[PDB]
Structure formats: C-alpha cells, structure tokens
Amino acid sequence: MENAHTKTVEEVLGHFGVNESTGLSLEQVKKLKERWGSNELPAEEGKTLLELVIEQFEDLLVRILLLAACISFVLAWFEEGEETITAFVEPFVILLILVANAIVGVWQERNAENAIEALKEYEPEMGKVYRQDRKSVQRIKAKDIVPGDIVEIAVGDKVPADIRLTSIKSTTLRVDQSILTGESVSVIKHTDPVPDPRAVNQDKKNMLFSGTNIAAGKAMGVVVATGVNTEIGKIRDEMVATEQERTPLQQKLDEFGEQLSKVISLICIAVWIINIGHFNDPVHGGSWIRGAIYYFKIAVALAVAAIPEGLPAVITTCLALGTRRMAKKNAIVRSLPSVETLGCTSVICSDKTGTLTTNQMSVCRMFILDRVEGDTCSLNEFTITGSTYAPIGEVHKDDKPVNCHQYDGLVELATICALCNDSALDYNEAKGVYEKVGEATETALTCLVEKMNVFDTELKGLSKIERANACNSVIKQLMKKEFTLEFSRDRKSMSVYCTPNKPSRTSMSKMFVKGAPEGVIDRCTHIRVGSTKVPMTSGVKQKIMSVIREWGSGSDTLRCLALATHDNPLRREEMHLEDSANFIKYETNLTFVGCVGMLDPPRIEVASSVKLCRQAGIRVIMITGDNKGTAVAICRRIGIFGQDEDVTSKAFTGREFDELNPSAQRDACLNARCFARVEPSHKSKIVEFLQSFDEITAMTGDGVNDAPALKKAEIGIAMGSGTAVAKTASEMVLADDNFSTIVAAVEEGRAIYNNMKQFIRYLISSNVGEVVCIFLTAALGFPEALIPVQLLWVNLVTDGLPATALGFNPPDLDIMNKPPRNPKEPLISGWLFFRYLAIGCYVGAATVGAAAWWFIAADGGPRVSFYQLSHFLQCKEDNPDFEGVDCAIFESPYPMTMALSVLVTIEMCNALNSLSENQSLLRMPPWENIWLVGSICLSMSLHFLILYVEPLPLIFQITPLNVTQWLMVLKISLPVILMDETLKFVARNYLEGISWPFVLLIMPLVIWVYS
Ligand SMILES: Nc1ncnc2c1ncn2[C@@H]1O[C@H](COP(=O)(O)OP(=O)(O)CP(=O)(O)O)[C@@H](O)[C@H]1O
Ligand SMILES: [Ca+2]
Ligand SMILES: [Ca+2]
Ligand SMILES: [Mg+2]
C-alpha cells in the first residue's frame, strides 16, 4: 500500500482487513509488528567529531593566531631550519592555546547534545487508536502503531504516522504541514480519492503525514506507512546544514572582536615603529634587516598576547553550558539564542488553563432550575466529590447523598455533557489511573456523566476499563449524532446535532449546546425547569449569572460552562456548514438546562515563581480566554494580584480592550497584568503591543490558541503536556511542566552574560598590562624585559585555561535582584573601561618595576643607579659614568625572569578577581569556582616547570629564582587583588557574609610575604 490516495476508503480498509468502527485486533498487531516493526526513525549522529572541531577555528580571532603561528614558523625555519630545540618552540606555544580552547569547546558542545538527546525520551510520544481490546479509544505509544490500525486525531495533535483519512468528524479539517511541504498555511483535507498516482505532497489530499500537526478539526483514518516508510522519513536524507543565525550577544562579541583586532594592529605597528633606533644595534649584529626582523617578532608575539583568542571558544562553552544546565532541569531548548534572550526578558505572558494550572479539571458542583417564580428562579445546586479523572464520586444535593434519576433536569444535563463531547476517558493498566483523551474541559464532563449515572445501570460487575465509558455509552446509544459544529473561539461555544434512535416518540432532532456561560445564556430564549419549558426573563437571567460569578470568584475559583439545548433546529440541508461564521446563526433560541463548574488547581511552583520574577524586574501577565472573574481569582491565588488589590484598570477583557482607541489601549497594555476572554487573534496582538515598548516578551502556552502568540514573542515556552502545535511554535519546551524552570532559564541567561563580562574584564585588564609593559620600558630607556618566546609563554599560561575557566563561574549573589538588561546598550561600559585601564596600568608598572628592582635594589644583582639603567646602551669601559659596572649584566636572564614571573603571577591573582563583577573575594572565595583553582595551579605548575626542569631555562632564556626573589614576585603581584577589591568596593557603594575560612587561610600568606 504505497498509493493510498488513489483508492477508495472502503478499498484501503479492505486491504488491511480492518474496520473503522471496531478497529484492529491484537493478533493482527502482533503479526504487523513483525513485518513492519516499530514506528520510529533511527537516531541521527548529528555533528561528528571532526566537523565539531572545524567550527572552533572559523572565527577571526582564532585565524589571527593561525597566521601568526605560520609567520613564526616561516621566520624560524629560514634560520636554523633543521632544529627542534628552541626554533619551533614559538609556533608550538601558539598552537597549544588553540587546541586547549578547541578541546574545551568540543567537549562542552558534545555534553550539551548528549543531555538534550537523553531528554527526548522523557515521556514517550503517544497516539490514540481503536483496537479490539476496548470498545473506546485508547492511548498507546506512537512507536507501537502498526500500518493498518484506526487512529483518531484532534486539534493540536501531532500525526503519528502516514494516515489515509477515513472519516472527518468536524465540518472541516486543517493540517499544518510546513515541516514537509513548506507551505505556511493550513491545508484543507477531505476523504475523497485523488486520481493522479504521482501527485505531489501539496496535491495529496485525504492523506495526513507524520510529523505534521492538526490545525483545526477532528478526523480518523487508517495508517498506511510507519517509521522510515513515511513522507517525512523518506526525506530524512534531504537534511541540509541550516544557517543558524548568531546569538544577538555573539553579534556584540563579533563587532567587539573586529574592533579589538583593529586597535591591536595599531599597537603592534607602533611597537615596530618606536624601536627604529634599535635596528642596527650590536645585539642584532649591526644589520638593519636583522634588527627589523627581530622587532617584527615582538610585534607578532604581542599580537598573540594581546588578542583574546579564547573569546569565540568561551561563548561556545557558556551557551553549551546553558543548554546542558536546562536539560538537567527538564527543559528542551530548541533555539540556541533562546536561553540568552530569557536573561533580558522583561515581560512573561502566560496561558492560564493548562499552563498556570495543572489542567487536572474535575466537575465539583452544578445546578439546574428547581422552580420559576416568574420573576426569580430557585436553583437545584448540587455538588460532586472527586478531584481526579476516575469515575468514582458521589452527587450531593445539600451535602446528602442523592440519586440523579429523580431529576429530569439532571438527566438532560448529563445528556448534553455526553453528546456535546469530542473527548473520552482512558484507563491506564500500566499506571493504574484514569487519564484523559482530548481536552481537560471535556473529559471532566465525561467523568461527570459516570458519577451522576442518570440511567441507573449495574456498574458493579464491570472491570476498570469498561467503567471509564460505561454511562456515556448508554447515553450515546439513545441518540444518533449527525454532525458537530466544532468549537470555535469566536463564539466560545460548541453544538452537536443529535437524533433520538427511538422511533416510538418520533422526536425531532435536537442541538445540544455547551460553551462559555456568558455567550450561551445570551443566545438562550427559554429555560428548562424540571421537564417543562418556560420562557426566559431578565430576572432569572441575573440569578443564573450571579451563581456563576460566585463560583469563579469564590475560594475554589471554578471554571464554569453552560449547557443548553435547541428544541427545533433546522435540517442539515438548510444549514450551510462550509464556513464557520454561520455556526452562531444556528445556536440561537436555545433552552437553558444547567451550568457546571469544574476546579482547576494552579501548579504548586507557580506562586513562588511569580514572586521571583517580580524581584528580578520581570512582569507576569495572564493572557487567558476564560472568564474574567475566574482569571482575576486565579491571579490573586498565584500572586499576580493581592487578595484585596483593586484591579479596575489592570484586568481587561477582549471586548473591553477593543472598545479603546489606540491612545488608552497603549497605556493599558504595560500597566495591565491579566487579559481574559481573548481570542488567539488578541493574544498575538497583546504580545506585539508589549514589543512596541522595546520589551523582550516571553510567551508561555499549551494550546492552539497560543501558537500565534508563541510565534510573535521573542521566546516561546511550551508545556510538555500541551498540544504539539504550541510545542512547534516554541523555542523552549518544559518537558516536566515545571513553571519554576522558566526563572531558572532567566537566571541561566543572566549567568551567560555575566561570565562573558568577567572573561572580557580578565583578558583586557591583563593584556593591557602586557602592552603597557613594553611601552613603559621603551619610554624609560630600560633594557627590554621580554623577548618574543616569553611574550608567547605569557599568552599560553594566562590567556589559556585560566580564561576559559571563567565560563564555569558561579552565579552572583544578586543575580536575580537586578532589573532586566537592555540588549541595545553597549557591551563595555565607561566605568568598566576605567577598571580595565586601572588594573592594566598596575600590571604593566609592576612588570617593569620587577626588572628595575633587580637592576637597582636586589642583593644578587648589581646596585646600578637609575641613570645607568636608563642609558645602558651608552655604556663602555671608557665612560666615566659607568665605573665598575660590567656592562654585560644588561643582558642577564635575571631581570627577564623577574618580569616573566611577575607577569604570570599577577595575572593569576587577576583571575581570582574575575569571579564576580562587584563581590569581594572574602564574600565569594575562589573555591566557588574549582575549575579556576585547578587552572591556576596548573598554570603555576607549568611556570615552575620551565624554571627548574633540565633544558627549559635555556630554551626560554630565563634563570631559576630563589625563595627571596620569589617573595619579591609575590610582593608586587598581590596588590593587584587589593586594587580590584577597591574598584569592586566603589562600584557597590557609590555606583550601585565574609568567609572567615578564607580570611584565616590568606593571613599566614599575607604576613609572610610582607613580614
Ligand atoms: N470544548 C469546548 N466546548 C465548548 N466550550 C469550550 C470548550 N472549551 C473551552 N470552552 C469555552 O470557550 C471559552 C474560550 O475558549 P478558550 O479555548 O480560549 O478556553 P481555554 O480553555 O483555552 C482558556 P486558556 O486560553 O487560558 O487556555 C472558554 O472559556 C470555555 O468556557
Ligand atoms: Ca592572547
Ligand atoms: Ca594575558
Ligand atoms: Mg491554555
């Protein structure tokens, strides 16, 4: 069966031997499972290891160090080419820092993919089928669907396999198949066969494809292909590498990356220029071209040192960390920019039903009319026990057990709930619980019919399975459903045209209507009291609405629904059911029967989440299509409003919002916190009004009425137990429906930006000190304190792992107390620019002072004066200004080792400053980031290694230091902490919990270094 769209519905069902009513057997499914297998696609390997490494070396900042490593190679291969001892050490230390950052980036990217893939199996994909075990619809796993079984699918569902449409229950069926054919509109389907055997998928009507969603309607069909035999499975090879747009923060770092490479080039050009007079010095052999090449290597080695080469890698691991940290909290992050954009979210619009509430509805009370005075009416208000979907409960009239058969209004109320219902109740023998098949509002009515049991049937000898739809089957055996005017959110109602099967009374067909109590009652002209009908007046209209308003605004905050019937409807011939606007024209002159109120408890984590968002400057707005009285009462429960807060201008309806010119409509959208009774058209309109104020909007939803708003918001967050239409229009999915994961995603997105600013602060405060070290030496006339191979050792030790370990920084202590960040402001602030220069100027002066100390004040070194150190090039044995000074000590490796050791040490102490922007080290000790402690101990281990290992001091032109000289290195390196603790102190006090184990740990160190 490969061309099913060209065959009649009877011909396809005959091919499988299946009936559309009873379904498929279980001896047939066992045979079909062996010949066809499970309905699932093989797992894709994704980005391979080699491809994942190539993406690390595609940024400009990494391509400079690649070219500089090539320059250092071709410049060291022409002099002493056949060598490996000291010639090719400069290109080697340039490549080690590149492969170190490439390993961390690939390993962290591989971790985020593994956590995401392990989250796809959180809850298995399910599918509704008809099988001969039960006479009702049952949920099974989508992988256990075999070709040939009857599958039922409704609005919002995801088509589990290729389905030949057998019967459409509603007036029309729309399917969103942009995933397969690429058309951005819902396609209308039918049940008639198409003649063309080679029709394209756009022309393949009467066929629903796996992976696509049902946009509107309800239908059933027979599966014709599963697994790799579906249209979306046969094209899984046509999966080209999509152009993933850069994160809006990555665009800020790319502009900053090219702006920094332009200023670094001007700095390296200046280094080669300010040293013109040193080209023909005797150190280089008196040759100009020999000295010009030497200072070209200092400029190249300074470019590698000054350029942040781990910046494209650290943004990779941070975004990869945010994805893995969210997948551990059961949150599927589809779009990479989504977790970073949530850190700047200012408004969180949220669906109420199914999103802020558990969606575990249960009809707990109802009422019918007892007797009509003529101006007022007495109501027979009942109550029902039970909070789950199990059909075990008791109906009480006045807290006394009552039987529903003696009330003819209850018999009629149960009939409307049974027939005007596109849902059912399923038993789960694996879990031992009754679960819903369809919407929660309708299954609550399906379970209510079982508890009422208006037609007293023997319900004791039936199993758990046959008790889910026992009382409903009795009602549906009495009335024959003709067609369904499906639920449309413009009228907020739904009717069903039923005909009584009994020909004895010869009753004409009726229309059983259920919907929102506000609109349905307005279309009601009569009221059903007991078994007789009496015309409705405006006095009894107030009594019915007042009870419903008490239910919604009460303590239980009930979700109400009115039930009505139409005694004399038009025939099917006169009704024009093609369009949907005529449906409200047939739901007129109704007879009000009763109203039901079902409880929908909010989720436990919602109340604490709204409190954390308000503290973080975020605003939570409830966009619901439910009643205003129910919405405001839920908002007072979850914390959006106070239990006595006035909401005269913070809660609006769809009608009240439209009856407002754009003047007041604007100033009401940023001040409101609850929108009730809004269509899917309004929800996206609310979201675009909030984006008009330059606000990052995050919409959270579960149903098809939220997909237009989920597409317009910057971030769309879908619930895991929601419809597949909402989960398709969303960037993040809460697999466990935990609303507290949203605020964790905001804290994580703010952490990605914080780790970025600390990385920038560390590689600019430090690398400026390496640039100042070279220019300060030149302006003072001192001997050069660093050679190219040592400028490349500082880059490896300081710009390597101690810089990437900043992406593992812990969140700040005030991370979620600051207002949301505006993504339009510049990356680096003007105050941060001062903090970079203030630290760098000390790092540079400390490195020059370390070399100047040995030449002037050290005991082992000469006691050379400041004049002789500044004019060291003019020293000969005939100069009376240089007496006793052996002027071969100006090339000694001691001052170059003091400067190399101070540069490395002062940058490790500057990394300890880069754990937070303003929190001191006594408040956030360095062991809160253990990846940084290990990176510093490794960098200091490698520094001590080249100082004392057999051949290495010769390769780097350094000499081993003693304990007295190492105490001097620490004397100058430690004040870089005190300088940044001071700059952090000013930012806290004048611009914007001391750990005693840390204070007591550093005091034996601080007193030792300074005596
Ligand atoms: N199957 C159904 N049949 C008839 N009326 C329904 C219905 N489902 C919901 N309604 C009613 O239509 C009204 C508005 O439609 P809507 O689809 O927006 O409700 P909803 O359950 O989605 C609230 P939310 O938007 O917060 O999820 C609801 O208040 C409800 O009373
Ligand atoms: Ca560097
Ligand atoms: Ca550095
Ligand atoms: Mg909802």
Q: What is the DSSP string of 467-521?
A: TSSHHHHHHHTTEEEEEEEEEETTTTEEEEEEEES-TTTTPPPEEEEEE-HHHHH
Ligand 1 proximity of 561 Cβ (cutoff 6 Å): yes
DSSP state of 205: -
CATH 3.40.50.1000, domain 331-357+603-745, yes or no = yes
Q: Which two tokens stand for residue 748?
A: 């994580």
Yes or no: say if 792 and 301 are a contact pair by the CB < 8 Å rule.
Answer: yes
What are residue 493's DSSP bridge partners? 488, 515
Crossing angle of helices 248-273 and 740-765, rounded to 10°: 0
Where residue 775 falls (left for φ over 0; alpha for ψ -120 to 50; beta otherwise) is alpha
Residue nearest atom 19 in ligand 1 by C-alpha distance: 625
Structure tokens at 848: 């020059």
Name the residue with tokens 């940058």.
Answer: 907
Q: Which amino acid is at 687?
A: V
- Mapped to the 3 state alphabet, what secondary structure does 173-232 carry? EEEECCCCCCCCCCEEECCCCCCCCCCCCCCCCCEECCCCEEEECCEEEEEEECHHHCCC
* 702 labeled binding residue: yes
Residues whose CB is less than 8 angstroms from the CB of residue 1000 and which lie 6 or more positions away in sequence, other chains included? none
* 8 A C-beta contact, residue 815 and residue 324: no
Asked if residue 747 has its Cβ within 6 Å of ligand 1, the reply is: no
CB 587 within 8 A of CB 525: no
Distance 763 CA to ligand 3 centre (A): 6
847 assigned ligand-binding residue? no
Q: Strands (DSSP E) along 909-975, which ranges? A: none
Give nearest CA residue, ligand 1 atom 7.
Answer: 515
- Ligand nearest, relative to CA of residue 260: 2
DSSP state of 602: B
Query: Is 514's C-beta closer than 6 angstroms to any atom of ligand 1?
Result: yes
Cα–Cα nearest to 257, from 215, 315, 204: 315
Query: Is the beta carbon of 683 within 6 A of some atom in ligand 1?
Result: no
What are the Cα distances from residue 105, in Å, to 111, 314, 435?
Answer: 10, 7, 44
Q: Is the CB of 441 under 6 A from ligand 1?
A: yes
For residue 834, what are the CA distances in angstroms to 380, 768, 839? 76, 12, 9
Is 305 marked as binding a ligand?
A: yes
Structural domain boundaries of the chain?
A: 1-243, 331-357+603-745, 362-599, 766-810+829-916+929-977
Pocket test for ligand 1, best of 155, 169, 487, 584 (most atoms within 8 A of CB): 487
Handedness of CA 443, 444, 450, 453 (dihedral sign): negative
588 marked as part of a ligand binding site: no
Give the relative orientation of helices 740-765 and 767-780 as an angle to the nearest 10 degrees.
Answer: 10
Please tell me the distance from the alpha carbon of residue 222 to that of residue 22, in angstroms, as a whole number: 12
Classify 766-810+829-916+929-977 by CATH class: mainly alpha
CA of 157 to the centre of ligand 1 (A): 17
Distance (angstroms) between ligand 2 centre and the Cα of 802 equals 12
- Determination technique used: cryo-EM
- CA-CA distance, 789 to 793, in Å (whole number)? 6
Q: Is 570 strand, coil or helix?
A: coil
* CATH of region 362-599: 3.40.1110.10
Tokens at 983, concatenated: 């700059």
Ligand 1 near 516 CB (within 6 A): yes
Nearest CA to ligand 1 atom 13: 492
* Ligand 1 pocket, residue 247 CB under 6 Å: no
- Are 169 and 137 contacting, i.e. CB atoms less than 8 angstroms apart? no
**Non-local CB neighbours of 591 within 8 Å, separated by 6+ positions:** 524, 525, 526, 527, 528, 533, 564, 565, 566, 567
* Nearest-ligand number for the alpha carbon of 301: 2
Q: Tell me the two tokens of residue 251.
A: 């665009």
The span from the CA of 678 to the CA of 661, in Å, is: 17
Q: Which phi and psi (to 5°) does residue 129 adopt?
A: -135, 165
User: How far apart are the C-alpha atoms of 62 and 71, rounded to whole Å?
Assistant: 14
Name the nearest CA neighbour of 319 among 333, 307, 308.
333
Beta-bridge partner residues of 213? 158, 176
Contacts of 680 (CB under 8 A, 6+ apart): 489, 704, 705, 706, 707, 708, 709
Q: Is 748 annotated as a binding residue?
A: no
Contact 305, 795 (CB under 8 A): yes
Is residue 769 in contact with ligand 1, taking CB distance under 6 Å? no
**CA–CA gap between residue 614 and residue 123 (Å, rounded):** 32
Q: What is the spatial distance between Cα 256 and Cα 312, in angstroms, rounded to a whole number? A: 11
Q: CA-CA distance, 418 to 469, in Å (whole number)?
A: 10
Question: Is the CB of 628 within 6 Å of ligand 1?
Answer: no
Element at 158 (helix H, strand E): none
Residue 258 neighbours by CB under 8 Å, 6+ apart: 60
Taking the C-alpha atoms of residue 925 and residue 105, their distance in angstroms, rounded to an integer, is 26
Task: Given CATH 2.40.110.20, say whether it is the number of domain 1-243.
Answer: no
**Is 683 labelled as part of a ligand binding site?**
yes
Q: CB of 442 closer than 6 A to ligand 1?
A: yes
24, β-bridge pairs:
131
Distance from residue 355's CA to the centre of ligand 4 (Å): 6
Is 189 in contact with 181 (CB distance < 8 Å)? no
Residue type at 314 in one-letter notation: V
Q: Which residues are catalytic?
A: 351
Q: What is the Å distance from ligand 1's center to 722 Cα?
A: 14
What does this entry list as its resolution, in Å? 2.8
Question: Measured in angstroms, how far is the CA atom of residue 798 from the centroid of ligand 3?
Answer: 5
Q: Which residues contact 737 (CB under 8 A, 6 or more apart)?
A: 603, 719, 720, 721
Residue 380 annotated as lining a ligand binding site: no
**Phi then psi dihedrals of residue 597, to 5 deg:** -125, 120
- As residues whose CB is below 5 A from the ion ligand 3, the structure lists 766-767, 798-799
Determine the 3-state secondary structure of 689 from DSSP: helix
351 Cβ below 6 A of ligand 1: yes
Q: Give me the amino acid identity at 854.
A: W
- Are 362-599 and 766-810+829-916+929-977 in the same CATH fold? no
Q: Give residue 413 CA to ligand 3 midpoint distance, Å.
A: 78
Atom of ligand 1 nearest to the CA of 625: 18
Ligand 1 atom 16: residue of nearest CA: 625
> DSSP code of 302?
H
982 labelled ligand-binding: no
Q: Whose CA is nearest to atom 27 of ligand 1?
A: 353
What's the CA-to-centroid distance between 726 and ligand 4, angstroms?
10
